């Protein structure tokens with residue numbers, strides 16, 4: 624329909640960021656973690672406020688054909704994210720880089736993720752299973768295996784492991800903490816902590832990134848009802864958060880992208896309800912159920 628000279632791409636004009644804006648109080652909640660087990664310093668509030676401003680700005684770009692692919696949106700999300708990193712940060716590179724096969728893909732379910740232990744144990748789709756470890760030996764774990772449907776191929780995304788033999792673990796740790804030392808232990812425990820999330824294999828990123836581009840293409844249509852629109856946004860958020868494309872910062876980028884797309888359509892999405900951590904809520908569910916409850920995870924609506 625229209626043509627953007629700057630990027631040399633035709634597009635369909637959309638209603639940029641609405642003029643009605645979230646209350647400055649909610650603006651400072653956008654992109655915040657908000658763990659149910661409890662962190663709102665002037666910094667945390669400024670970080671969120673900034674995410675809010677940049678979200679609407681990228682949404683403005685999208686509505687003008689300035690951003691033309693998901694990959695491009697993810698890039699704007701990454702650059703905003705990197706701007707919040709302290710000068711000379713050694714982690715800077717992890718926040719700017721995509722994840723690969725021989726790299727970190729595990730999140731030990733310790734503080735601040737403690738509240739995930741319950742969600743897994745009580746998960747209607749979790750199944751008892753026996754985990755084999757070179758250290759702890761065999762353990763009884765409640766396991767939730769997140770999967771996705773893609774072109775007829777059902778793939779495994781995130782896997783949650785939660786050891787159930789409490790007493791036995793206390794003793795195993797005590798013994799090991801003396802046979803390997805607090806040091807060697809933490810290293811092995813960085814990848815094999817009884818309670819952990821084994822993230823999506825990086826080998827699936829390419830088809831997932833392509834799928835995210837396909838949802839973006841759909842999401843920027845000018846003839847979508849707000850019901851069809853909200854669904855697409857929830858899906859995009861689901862796939863992005865569950866894929867965890869980058870070595871670091873995926874949840875911020877994922878939420879940023881999802882809200883940038885909504886913002887391009889005028890939708891001013893309020894922050895997530897206290898206790899509702901978007902990426903985790905996504906990793907703990909199937910695509911369809913996540914889309915169904917997306918609205919309820921947000922404040923008003």
Ligand SMILES: Nc1ncnc2c1ncn2[C@@H]1O[C@H](COP(=O)(O)OP(=O)(O)O)[C@@H](O)[C@H]1O
Pocket residue numbers: 654655656666667668670671870871872873874875876902
């Ligand atoms: N300074 C901060 N204040 C408030 N929330 C933050 C801050 N930094 C990051 N977050 C948020 O907390 C979550 C963790 O981000 P994520 O990128 O997945 O983490 P990491 O790669 O560091 O594990 C996201 O919801 C993110 O937007």
